[PDB]
């Protein structure tokens, strides 16, 4: 009978299944063109405010596009968390998750195997794949020169698909030099992205020290040699006194004029407390009123106001000092030193450029381009590069790229496919064909024949060698160690683990219950 209500779509075991698989096909065909170095970027047009967005990342493509399909929402969420974990490889999760379901659609229809039996093949196949992925890795970080070279290769492999593919030889130095300056600290908040219109893509230059978009006061000078930097999370504004609930009872206005004299004398004594250190600049988090601003003139102190919360830590780590608010004891809180405090102009906005600091634990990537859509792509491209290289510092193991990681994992899966009895061995081989489909797609986006290079790569690796890969520039098999293509071990581990869990969730479905929308 009718059990749900009006305007409620229900499906049962032939409409429920084949609606998620066609949704997995629908979400996978979109991100098929974005995979690889020769991939085309997708343009997203918003429904409101005529906001356009040029982006190559599969997560950002799925963030903006609305998708009412429940099966596609699983692919939307797994690309979100994959961007949260590593930052790169979200497209490979969506492609590998869709092709695993594309293969499983045939095993359910053609071979007539239960869904639970397909998962049991994927559990053993995924275990054999990760064991081969663990053994195929190589140690690093024992020699800093090799660790420097591998980060350059990882930056080249990451930016090969983004808009920086042509200038990756120059941006690889910019990407890897900033990470080594972190001194092991894994955090992306210490890197600023300043948007500048004009120039070309290769005009991005490496900055010595730290640069930000702020300005001096009204009366401050242009240049001060060997300036001492201080950072105040203070209120140099109308301080009030903090026992909110203070009011001023006044019997006559004679003492009220002397009361206002005490307020000016209160802040004068506070600025006099600043001058005991003998600093040359003063950085405040919030706005500085004019009366503090005039007092820094005769004392020879620079003033910078309205600093962001991230900018405090980003500037303090480069300075080396600590944020001070009390200003009571001059013994502790040793401040840094900067040689050149002179500002420069890049475009129509002046920026305060620093140089010759104690430490460079925070950095700033200056970018140049034509359109803001390209700068947004430049931001997302290097954010994925810096995110992968930053996690490579903590996780040392890496694995060869260029499609060799997919085929070398499928070798152990195919080896373990023969000794497994029952119908799940076909599902173990279906997992192998899913790994083979990634380099099949890399040849399709490049416009070369896919069946020949996959057949040559597959026959070559079974001979005994395990260093061969796809060279899409020449269109043939080549040595990946010569070209210098390598990726992190946690990236491909997260992709295979996320794709295995992606197929597992959607394969354990039998009914769809879509309640009424609000």
């Amino acid at each position: 009978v009718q059990i749900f209500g009006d305007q409620v779509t229900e499906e049962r075991a032939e409409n429920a299944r084949l609606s998620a698989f066609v949704g997995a096909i629908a979400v996978g065909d979109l991100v098929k063109s974005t995979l690889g170095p020769k991939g085309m970027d997708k343009l997203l047009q918003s429904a409101s405010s005529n906001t356009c967005m040029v982006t190559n990342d599969g997560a950002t493509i799925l963030k903006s596009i609305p998708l009412d399909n429940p099966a596609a929402k699983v692919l939307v969420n797994i690309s979100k968390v994959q961007d949260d974990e590593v930052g790169d490889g979200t497209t490979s999760v969506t492609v590998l998750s869709a092709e695993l379901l594309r293969e499983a659609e045939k095993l359910i229809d053609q071979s007539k195997i239960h869904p639970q039996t397909i998962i049991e093949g994927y559990r053993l196949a995924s275990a054999a794949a990760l064991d081969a992925l663990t053994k195929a890795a190589v140690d690093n970080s024992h020699d800093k020169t090799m660790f420097r070279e591998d980060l350059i290769h990882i930056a080249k492999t990451t930016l090969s698909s983004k808009i920086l593919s042509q200038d990756k030889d120059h941006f690889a130095e910019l990407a890897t030099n900033a990470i080594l300056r972190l001194k092991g600290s894994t955090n992306l908040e210490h890197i600023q992205i300043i948007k500048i219109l004009g120039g070309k893509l290769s005009d991005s230059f490496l900055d010595e020290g730290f640069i930000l978009a702020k300005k001096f006061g009204n009366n401050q000078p242009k240049r001060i040699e060997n300036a001492k930097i201080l950072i105040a999370n203070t209120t140099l504004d109308t301080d009030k006194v903090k026992i909110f609930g203070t009011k001023f009872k006044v019997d006559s206005t004679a003492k009220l004029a002397q009361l206002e004299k005490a307020e000016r004398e209160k802040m004068k004594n506070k600025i006099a407390k600043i001058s005991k250190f003998g600093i040359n600049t003063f950085i405040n988090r919030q706005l500085i009123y004019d009366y503090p601003e005039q007092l820094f003139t005769d004392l020879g102190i620079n003033s910078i106001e309205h600093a962001d919360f991230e900018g405090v830590e980003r500037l303090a780590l480069v300075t080396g000092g600590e944020v001070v608010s009390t200003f009571d004891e001059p013994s502790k809180c040793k401040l840094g030193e900067c040689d050149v405090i002179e500002e420069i102009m890049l475009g129509e906005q002046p920026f305060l450029k620093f140089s010759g600091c104690k430490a460079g634990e925070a950095c700033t990537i200056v970018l140049r381009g034509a359109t803001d859509q390209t700068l947004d792509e430049a931001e997302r491209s290097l954010h994925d590069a810096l995110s992968v290289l930053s996690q490579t510092t903590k996780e040392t193991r890496t694995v060869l790229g260029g499609g060799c990681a997919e085929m070398v994992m499928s070798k152990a899966v195919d080896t373990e496919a023969q000794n497994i009895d029952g119908k799940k061995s076909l599902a173990v081989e279906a997992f192998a064909r899913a790994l083979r489909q990634l380099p099949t797609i890399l040849a399709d986006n490049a416009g070369f024949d896919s069946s020949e290079l996959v057949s040559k790569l597959r026959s070559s690796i079974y001979n005994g060698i395990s260093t061969s890969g796809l060279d899409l520039n020449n269109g043939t098999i080549a040595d990946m160690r010569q070209l210098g293509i390598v990726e992190s071990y946690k990236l491909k581990r997260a992709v295979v683990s996320s794709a295995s869990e992606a197929a597992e969730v959607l394969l354990r479905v039998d009914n769809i219950i879509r309640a009424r929308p609000r």
Partner: protein
């Protein structure tokens, strides 16, 4: 010679690139008149 090594599927990118080119050139035709000393002014 023929029927080998490829077949170009998904020609909609070719159709989309043509639509974007003629769309950009049609906007450029209105801006083209304002070039040089003998150009004209535009009121919007």
């Amino acid at each position: 010679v023929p029927s080998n090594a490829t077949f170009k599927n998904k020609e909609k990118p070719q159709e989309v690139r043509k639509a974007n080119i003629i769309a950009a050139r049609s906007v450029a035709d209105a801006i083209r008149t304002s070039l040089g000393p003998k150009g004209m002014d535009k009121m919007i």
